[PDB]
Every structure is written in structure tokens, then in C-alpha cells.
Subunit: 401 residues, 3 copies
Amino acid sequence: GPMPTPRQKPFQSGSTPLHLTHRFMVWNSIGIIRCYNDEQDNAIDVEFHDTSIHHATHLSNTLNYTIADLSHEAILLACESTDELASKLHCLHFSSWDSSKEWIIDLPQNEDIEAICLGQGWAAAATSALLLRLFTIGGVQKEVFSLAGPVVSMAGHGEQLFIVYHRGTGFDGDQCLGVQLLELGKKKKQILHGDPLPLTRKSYLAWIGFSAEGTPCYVDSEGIVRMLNRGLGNTWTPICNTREHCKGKSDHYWVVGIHENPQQLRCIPCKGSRFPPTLPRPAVAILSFKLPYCQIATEKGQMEEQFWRSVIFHNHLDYLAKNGYEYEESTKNQATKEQQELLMKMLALSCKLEREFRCVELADLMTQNAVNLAIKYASRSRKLILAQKLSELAVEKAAEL
Amino acid sequence: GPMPTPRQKPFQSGSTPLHLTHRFMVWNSIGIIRCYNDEQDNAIDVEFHDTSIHHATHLSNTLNYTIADLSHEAILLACESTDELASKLHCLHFSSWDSSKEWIIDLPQNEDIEAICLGQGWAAAATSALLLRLFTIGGVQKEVFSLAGPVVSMAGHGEQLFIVYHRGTGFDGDQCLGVQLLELGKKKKQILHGDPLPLTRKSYLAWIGFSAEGTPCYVDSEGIVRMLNRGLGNTWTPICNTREHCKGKSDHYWVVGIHENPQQLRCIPCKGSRFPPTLPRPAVAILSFKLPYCQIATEKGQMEEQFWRSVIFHNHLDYLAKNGYEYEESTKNQATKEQQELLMKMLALSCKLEREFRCVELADLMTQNAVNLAIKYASRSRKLILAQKLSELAVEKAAEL
Amino acid sequence: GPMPTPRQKPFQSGSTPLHLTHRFMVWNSIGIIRCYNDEQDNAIDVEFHDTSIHHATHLSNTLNYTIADLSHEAILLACESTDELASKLHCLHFSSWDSSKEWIIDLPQNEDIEAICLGQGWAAAATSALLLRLFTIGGVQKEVFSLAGPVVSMAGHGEQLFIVYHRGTGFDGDQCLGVQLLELGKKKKQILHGDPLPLTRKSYLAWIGFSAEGTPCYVDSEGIVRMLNRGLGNTWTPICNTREHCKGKSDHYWVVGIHENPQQLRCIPCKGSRFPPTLPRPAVAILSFKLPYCQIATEKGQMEEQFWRSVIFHNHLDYLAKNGYEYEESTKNQATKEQQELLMKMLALSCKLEREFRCVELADLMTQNAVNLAIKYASRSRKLILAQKLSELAVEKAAEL
């Protein structure tokens, strides 16, 4: 019969394989951590993206760390549970008010760290006992809970903690993963509470994290980037099949990060290997998103892609408004005006195509000012039926606005 | 040892398999869509149950429109991706006033289709890439999101969408199915977050859909009708073992529609098969539901079954009311009247049995007017302790209210 | 490679195996039910820990009941179906005011009860049709719905109904279990609606139930006790490792009850066996709960583990107050006082360690009135930056307040 797929070993997002004599511990927007290791010595460097965060710093890998993660508040490290020493979690809170910026924790006996991440104001790790441990940046042990399966990876941004694990057994080459998403805020909540994780056929998970604006996203082995549509009931929307940015199967991409505004994907181009060449220091490439949409060669399909790209990449403004962070409303005004002008162009093209019911549907998707301009567009060429029905739809909108 | 179950192939909701010269591609409450295919052409025939919806219509193409759906506003068809054509969706928005009396849209390369459905001004389709495509019925591309697994079937009604897919790996004949439901009104919501789908042991899903009053329902291969009981925090209540009816004289009762006002299952009696042949014209058998309540030979059990069947069906009126749609208060009043009468009559039966605690328990399920009538009955029958307990219940309810 | 596991058969909490001649059918906080079959008689003995509740009861086991549950309100019994007689549900509502304290129900033909449980005024039964049936404690049939898989066990407390089932097939020793937690109160809800249930590796589920204070809890075959953390988004927090408490690690404890205030784990030690013998009668041992924190022998570890233990246990006060159940305000006063004096001592230790950012992180959990004491403590010995930043924290808390 069909075989069960082997579960993929856990990874740190943006990292590189352990065995490389030089490797990148993690690529991230704050600063690049890299390591040299061989049969007789081992050392770690951190190379900050902006030196105003902190100057570049170097350490000897005294306790043989194998995992790490960075934020602009602190840098974390973690090691294996050796026979002489169980797994240790280490931190330099380099941005602290106090000079006692270093601290370390050692797990109970026969327990090993499998993943580690940072947010803002907290740290987190997932261990070999299917047990997740929260900490503060200064190393107070916060609450603890058990995971439903072995962890694949984890990430964080602000009060958001993202975990992905093996919810079950994969079959005939496909993996079987689930996702938890926790709010470590004023009220502890769990928007995703073990839901299944979509993946491309016979693929495996390759990268996770958040955009710089705090929206969760991930990439699988086929390069299809998916992002959490918070508008459509917290569901995973694809945003880029990165294979089309490649010259072919010769190339892969290793994501450094994603920016929801400006609409950018930042990654290392890699040839042959999925992970980049370890030396010399590679240069980061930047790519543009295009949502996978049908008939995209046509201008109407292209602007449909532009519209849904605009709203999906300004969902973060709604999330910022809800969570209480500072943001500028001019961004939402720009997004609404741009996507409503695009919707105006679609309505004009549909009107010229005589698909006036499609114009009324587009006007249902419109804001009131755009419906008024659509009524004027329907008045051009004297299409009175469409103009009357657009006016009626405007009245219906006014009844609720 | 244990054996993995093979995943079943997808089916369009309410359709026959492709292994016959003539098929029902969809049979809704609206009407029937047939397909006859041979070496000459593929002939699609639409027959409305009421011609006031629209007249009988016929299409014919070399394209094999392998998937179909029907609604009061429009007809919908779709065809698979071939070695030279990508998939295409086809529609006839017959109710329209513009030039959208026909519409065709492509889908990308390798975007093979499994199932499609219709909504109030909406349309939807599932892809072999595990992306759900959403559209307006006039034909704008709406949002896209990633499906958690291979979809087995799909359905729609109003502003709500119902999806069933393969959640994991089955074993020993059981199929590991998951269910997802979304609502797309003013606030876009996700009711079922990818939860498991109950099924009879070693059964396979045979039909899904909505009741005509707008709640999801489905039937498995053993003939067990189930529906999403939203009076129980959205759990699956079984309603009918269709193999019972007419002492199982027909080897199957191929469901085509469900109603609860009146209480009517619409189905086709099938002899020696799970589905009927498309010609000669099968007759619609109408069957009444029978919930699987215990000790059904007794008056007590029959009154219980009547009461709970009534309340699960007439709970839909409150759902329709609170979600902002039109509903009928006379039917709600009749439902309440029958429920109070059933509780009163079975209270009298339990009084005859001297099971006064059952009488108080039944009084908990009815209003203050019925409780006062029961108190006066208790006074007439000189059951003072029963009257006192009912009076204490009335005092507690009045203090709470 | 991996191999599928045999999904374990259903069980009942505090039972011992059916093959025994003389066994416990249930042992809980209420009392004990024993059953035996020998040449002298086939019978069931019910007895209560507090004899004021009800006298010891004895029943001839002619119908061969096999599953049982005990509550303050009633005794509930069930049997597997044989060929001539169906599976039957039997109840003794001894706390009733009417003389007809017994009632009996007979299930549909070849339907078979596989688990039962009791609650405040209701009873539940899970059957071989993957069907859960609700009854009033006086035997009126309440609502019916389909389970997502074969059950393993059930439990009830007040309005809460806790169900665990097989959501799938496990591999490589593990069991694939899902948890479903209903509330049957004034509005029907699902707190957990099929979430995966954590387990230790290669374990099986050994015990389920509620604390006396009404929080769901369970124990796996590796002796790890887990409780539902309602203050952390309804995740699962381990609260005790019974293996560390044993005289020798080959032996293990058999749980019968849980209490949060006082913190008690009620269990029976077993000499070389999974469960205790029925005679000579076991003695219930008390074990203290222990969160699995790191560096737990240090003063930091002692303080923080006690803090988190205290707060996760005193979540039940919040649940009771939110759902309208009465409670003594002295419990909340004592909980807040203990937590605050403890965290004041922890603040003193972090202050003397001169980690003032850790002090701010610790004091973030506190009320500003209590943070004023830490401000004065920082003023003592002139820890100026610590005093200033605790003052800023108090000002921010007052600004939010």
C-alpha cells in the first residue's frame, strides 16, 4: 500500500544546515548571525543590518550553540542536551536599561531545545518533550504548555507567537503539519489553535515568520509564499509562486524577510542548493509580489491582481488599529484611493464591455465616492439603466453608512 | 495489520459518475442539468422545475463540461485542464438584464478542477493546486486562499460556503475527512475551522448540500442523513437512516434535496445501485425524517423524538432572523405551540407514571404560561408537591428574567 | 520505517480491567462502585466515602453491567449489547424526591454503549454508532449528535461535558487523540471542538476528569498530569510528574481525583501494576502538584514555579465568577495576596541581583499599589534607576487604569 511520509526534522527559519563548516545561523531583517565551526574550533558573529541597533559583535562558541534568533531587543542562542550538560538557553539583552545584560537557563534532565524564537517583550522555546516554555527578555520563566505534536519551527512578532508542528502522519510523500498562533497580550488568546497547514503536493515546509508589519506568512519547498488573510476569516492566501522569478530549476531562493509595505520579498538567490553559498558574503535580492490569479496576461486580470494585492497588503493597518499600535492613516487613505481607482478602471472596462451587472458588482465592492464616480461613468455614453441601478446601490449603501 | 484507506475521488454535489453515456451533472431544487456525451458532441441540457425561473435550455460543445451547478440567478459549468487547454468555467446568468447571459473564464495552467458551487451573487471553485477560487456571478475574480487538502465536494447557499476535503490518512476503510465553512457577509467569518467530519464506520461521503432553508447537510454511503446543528454549538445531528424507509425495499434512496418547511427529504429510489440511470425519467420519492431516538415504540419516546425533531428544524428560523434575513413569525409561533403542547402531554404521561421528577424536568423546557397551566393541572389532580416544585421553578425563572 | 499503532479500546476513569473476577467499576471523589462475578453471586456494590450522602447499595448483576459512573445525584450503569438484548442504560437517581428513583432505557437494535458519564442534572452516553446521546438525570432524552471518531472516555462536571476520541491513526507508539469539550448550559457551546490532545511519546491516555473546582484534567500512561489553562487561551499545562514521586520508578500511581484549593492530587500507589488490586482495600495517597520549570531548586525557580502554580490553579475562580457560579471572595483575596507577597520577595531578590529590567518585567505582573512597595524597596539602598523605572511602570499602569 501507499507509504507513510517521513516527518521533516525541525529547523530554525532562515537558517542553514548545521554541518557546514561556515554557516548562516539565521538571516533576518534586524541583523545576520553567522558561525564558523570545524573539528577543533567554533565561533559566532552577529552582523547588524543597522549599526544604530548595536555594533557588530563576535563570540567564541564556548557552549556549542546550534540555534539562535534575533530581535532589536535581544539575541538568543541554544545548544544540545549533552550527557555532561542538558540543553541551555542563552541570551544577551543588548538593548537593556541595566548592565547585567547576559543570562542563561538550563533545561531539566534529558530535555533538549528543538526550536527558539523572539517577539517583543518575550522569548519562547520548544523542547524535545513536546513542551513549549515561554520566557521574558530578561529571563523570567513565563507560562508553559504542551504541544500536540513534535515542533517543526516557531517564530514571533510583537505579542504574536507562531508555532508549526506535525499534527499527524504524512502519506505518499506529502507532509502533515498543523499551526498554532498565540496572542501573548493583555488577554491571552489563541486565534489558531492547532489548525491544519496547507502545503503544495508532495512538498515540505521551508520558511516561516512574519512580515515586518506583523502579518504571519510561510513558504514551502515549492516556493509558494502564503500569508494570513486576516480579513477572510484568518485563512492562508498565496501571494507569490517564487519559481517564476527563477531562471529555472537551476535556482532557488532563501527568504531573508518580507515587507507588507513596501510590497517586497527579500531573499538570497541560490544555485543548485536550496540554501545559499556560505562564502563569500552573499548579496540580498529583492522581488515583487504577484498574487496567483487567472487570465493575468490580460489587463483586467492584471489589475484584479493589483486590487487584491493592495487590500491583502494593507490588512496590516486593520490589525494595527485593532491591537493598538501606532500607525498613520494616510497609508490606508492611499491604499483605498489606489484600489478604488483600479476598481473604477475595471468598472469602466466592464461598462465598455456591456457587462453592466459586473459593473454593479464592482460598485458593490466600491466605496460610496467611487460609486458616485461610477454613476458618472455610466452617464457617459448615456447608459441610463446602469446609472439608475448604480444610484440605487448608492442609496442602499447610504442606508447603512 | 492495519491498512491505509485510499482517498475517494471528488464528486460534484448531487451528481452521477462519468461511467454512463448520460449523466445528471447536478440536480438542485432549481432544476436538473444533464450531460450526454458521445463521439459526436457533449450535449448539456438544463431543465428548470419551474419554468418561471427560466425556460428549458440546451447547450452543446466539444468541450466536456464535467462539473455543473444551478441557482435561481444563474447556471454554472466547468471543464478540466487537458494536454492543450487549461481549465475553463462557464456560466449563464439568465436572470440578468445586461449582456451577461453568458460568461466564460479561464484558469491557469495545471489548474485542474474538482468541484464548483454558487452563492447569492457569488461563485466558487476548487483547484488541483489546492487553491479555492472565488468569483462574482457576473464574473469578477474575488479572493483566493489555500485549501488544507484535496477537496471531495463543495456546496453553497446565500452568503455562506460549505467545503469538505480529505483531512489526513484513513485506515481500515474509514476515510479521514475534514469540513470547512465560511460566511461572506458584511463581516467575513469562518464557522468551522477545518474540523473533522463524522461518518459511519467504513462509510464514504455520498452527498452534501444545504437544506432549502439554508443550513448544511450531508449523507454518507450508509444512508445516514446529518446536518450542522447550530442549536448545539455547531455539531452534527443525525436525522435519518434512509435505508430504513419502506423497509429498505430500494437498495438506495439517492438524495437530491432537503427541506424542513415542510419536513421533506427529496430522493430517488434506486434498485441495485447507489445512483439512478439518467433515463428513463426517475421519480422523486418524498420521505419524512425519523431521528434515532431510543425506545421509539413508546409514546414517551415518540413525544421526545417529535419534540427534538421539531426544535432542531425550527431553530433555523432564529438563525435566519439573527443573521439579518427575512423569516416567518407565524411558523415560529406554531413551532413554539407544538413544542409546549408536546412538553405538556408528556408531562401528563409522566404524572400518570408517578415520575414527578420528569414532570419538573419537562417544565424546565417550557415558558411561564405553560408552567402555570401545568401548575393548574397539578392543583386539579391534587399533586401538591409537583405544584410546589413547578411554582418554585416559576419563581426562579421570574427572578432571573 | 514507522508503523501504525493499535488505537486503544475505550475505558472509564477509575475503573480496573473487565477480565477480573472482582474489580472497581469507578473510583472518584464521590465513592466507589465494585462489581464481581463468582459462584456465590453476580452483583454490584456501591459505596460512598461520606456516608451522609447515601447508604451503601447492592444490585444483582443479572443484566451484566460493565460501565458505571457515580455522582452526588445518581448512579449510572450501562452494559454491552448481546444477541437477544440490546445495550441498555440504567440509572438510580437516589437523590430524587419521588419514589420512582429508578429508570431504564434500551438502545436501538445492535447499537452498543461504549462509554458513559454523569453531570449536574444530566447523563451522557457514547455508543458504537459514533453517536453521543444526552439524557436528563430523570431519563428524558435530550439532544443527540455524532462524534468525530471512536470515543476513548468521557467525563462531566456541572454544565461541562468532556469527551476524548480517536481523531486518526497514530504511528510509532503514539496515539492520535482529539478532545471535544461541550458546555450544556443556558447557551450551548464548544470550548474545544476537536482539538488535538497532547501526549508524551509512545504513551496512551490513562485517566480523564475534572478538578473538584471544575477544570478539565487528564493523565497519560507516563504519569504526566495536565490541566486546562483557561488563563492561557485554553491550552494544556502540565502540573505534575507522578513518576518522580514514586518509591521506585517501576511502580506508579493510579489517579482518582484532583483538587486545586488545597492543591492535592488524589491517587493510589500500585506495587508492580498499572492499577490497584480490589482487595485488600487501597489507601488514597496525596501528592503535591509541581510545575516542570527549570532551575527549580533555586530561589528564582521556587518562587516563579509557585507563582505560576498559584495563578493557573486560581483560574477556576475566574471561570466560576464569569459563568455566575457563587464563590467566596476570600479565595480571590488569598490568591492575590499570596501571589503579590511572593512576587515582592522575588522583586527583592532581583533587586539585590541588580537586574532592574528583570525587576520591571517581574513587576509588570503586579498591581501598582504593590509596585509602590517595590519602589520604596528600591529607594532603600539607593537603587535609583530601579526606583525610577518602577515608578514609570506604576505611572503607565495608572495611565491604563
